[PDB]
Amino acid sequence: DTHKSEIAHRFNDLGEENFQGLVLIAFSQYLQQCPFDEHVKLVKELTEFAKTCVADESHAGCDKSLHTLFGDELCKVATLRETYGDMADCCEKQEPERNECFLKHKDDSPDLPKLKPEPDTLCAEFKADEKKFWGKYLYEVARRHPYFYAPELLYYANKYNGVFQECCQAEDKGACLLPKIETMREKVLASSARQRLRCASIQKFGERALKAWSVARLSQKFPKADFTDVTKIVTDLTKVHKECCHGDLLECADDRADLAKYICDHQDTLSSKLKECCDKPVLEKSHCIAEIDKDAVPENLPPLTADFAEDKEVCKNYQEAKDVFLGSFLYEYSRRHPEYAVSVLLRLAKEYEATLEDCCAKEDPHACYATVFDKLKHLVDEPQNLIKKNCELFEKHGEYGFQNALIVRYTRKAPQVSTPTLVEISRSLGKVGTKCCAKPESERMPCTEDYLSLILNRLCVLHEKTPVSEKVTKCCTESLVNRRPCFSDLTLDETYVPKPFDGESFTFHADICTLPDTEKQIKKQTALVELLKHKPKATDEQLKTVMENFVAFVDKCCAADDKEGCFLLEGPKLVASTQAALA
Ligand SMILES: O=C(O)Cc1ccccc1Nc1c(Cl)cccc1Cl
Ligand SMILES: O=C(O)Cc1ccccc1Nc1c(Cl)cccc1Cl
Ligand SMILES: O=C(O)Cc1ccccc1Nc1c(Cl)cccc1Cl
Ligand SMILES: O=C(O)Cc1ccccc1Nc1c(Cl)cccc1Cl
Ligand SMILES: O=C(O)Cc1ccccc1Nc1c(Cl)cccc1Cl
Ligand SMILES: O=C(O)Cc1ccccc1Nc1c(Cl)cccc1Cl
Ligand SMILES: [Cl-]
User: Fold this and answer.
1) What is the fold of 494-571?
2) Quick one: which atom of ligand 2 is closest to the CA of 136?
């Protein structure tokens, strides 16, 4: 809800620590290249202004919107001109256009330095000033992930500070904290990906897509709840995500906290797993709620055919109350299959909807849609062979070889895409093998659909930033939930025109020899992509031959006395072997 003085309302509701953290995340995400200390100064200003309005809400400016107050502060910054180019034209503008402009310049691949944990340095900053150290975490993560779910980031900052509580007085510091940080990293990065999808769903596919996703998710977590209660939570959760995805972080966090309280107050009718969550403080409580994945299927439920195929009013309901009805389908399907991937459940609803659009026009609709559930069950099973084949490949060759097989597959599909993006995405796809292939047989498909949804959304976000392939555009935009089928269906892109081999220009040198081992692995994956960009029709056996040659040449020359000399002499020999091989 809104108050006359929104700044006072949210300061009152959130309290000063969380208010400050949230405002710092806002500024970090709007202005990702700006330094920490400049952000801190604006947050302090606004905080101090907040306190003025709490004490006297009649004070000048206290009835301004949050965007006005945020924006005026962003426009103090002189360097907006230098550091952002045509974004200081946001500052030239006034609200509500200004805020929109700022939002549009969030950068999904800002290319800041890779963060590296240095235990002694970190421990000393923690000692010096814990609050600054917390703030610095919020800043560094937020600016790398400009749609990170902001109240979840506050929870993670508290966990981060806890790692250093534990480890800094420990004798051996890095032994204690490096693995903690590694673990936290993978969890934060997963969280950012799941939120980036949520935000894509609303931004690119509309509020109705986000509602659809929410009804499916919530029905797997709280399947014993009634539809009217699930739908209440959907309405609230949808408002929360809309706010967070739009950069309305103070409202997001406040509404989130209210929704956590509602959930906990109604825990007996929603899920027994809430018992672990509901006596925690707000941020941890909310995180715990988010972490719940599923409950048991309620006993004694009727077949879905009753409401969705037998009922004489199926067409009526589809026609007159379409959103409610598709919502009910989602709730009822989801609650019966709480282990399914959400994207699959949505894929089913979409086909159900398509079935009704075709059949409800006919003289005997029921004749036409009576068997729709059998078609849906088949749709669930469609990719089981290929998933099995993928997991068999992973088992036979391991993660790095599985990534290599994916580089080939994906480069053929989308050869226009940049080499760093093809490598990033293919390595992430290969990690799906490790995360999913030793799940129970029956849990593999939902595992792989879930991660694929996240990884392909990353692809699509990177592609939006600089579009290069009509086929990737098409798959990214045709339908959010059928992205995985779309991309799987793509074949070699014959639209692509390869540039010739720069046959006189040989491009590899002895500085490869000193790389850390994982960087040596990436260098070989980069080489593979480039080989495919020059000879996009090469066979698997050809690419293997050439890559084998390449790695023997690198090993031979990195072990030589004169290393660069070997690269220079034998490099031309490599190009010759390669040519003969790619005929
Ligand atoms: O304010 C303090 O006492 C500690 C401190 C030191 C350096 C930088 C920031 C902060 N605190 C702080 C932070 Cl970490 C973020 C936003 C607003 C404030 Cl006041
Ligand atoms: O490592 C990342 O890419 C982000 C990330 C997520 C969770 C925890 C830490 C980090 N990065 C990071 C590192 Cl590597 C060191 C010190 C402080 C930070 Cl925020
Ligand atoms: O729209 C809302 O705020 C919640 C609501 C309540 C009852 C029925 C449908 C909906 N929303 C909704 C919509 Cl608009 C589309 C697909 C799935 C759902 Cl749950
Ligand atoms: O791509 C396919 O045809 C099979 C398929 C279906 C559902 C989910 C994932 C996958 N494939 C797949 C798998 Cl199983 C793991 C890692 C990367 C990919 Cl592309
Ligand atoms: O030498 C280069 O990097 C460019 C070039 C020119 C002619 C023939 C092949 C290549 N590159 C090349 C070779 Cl020779 C082997 C494996 C991977 C690559 Cl990218
Ligand atoms: O030398 C080899 O053949 C192993 C190798 C090294 C670097 C890059 C790729 C490959 N192998 C390879 C190739 Cl070229 C394609 C698909 C799957 C695999 Cl394992
Ligand atoms: Cl949440």
Assistant:
1) Serum Albumin; Chain A, Domain 1 (1.10.246)
2) 19
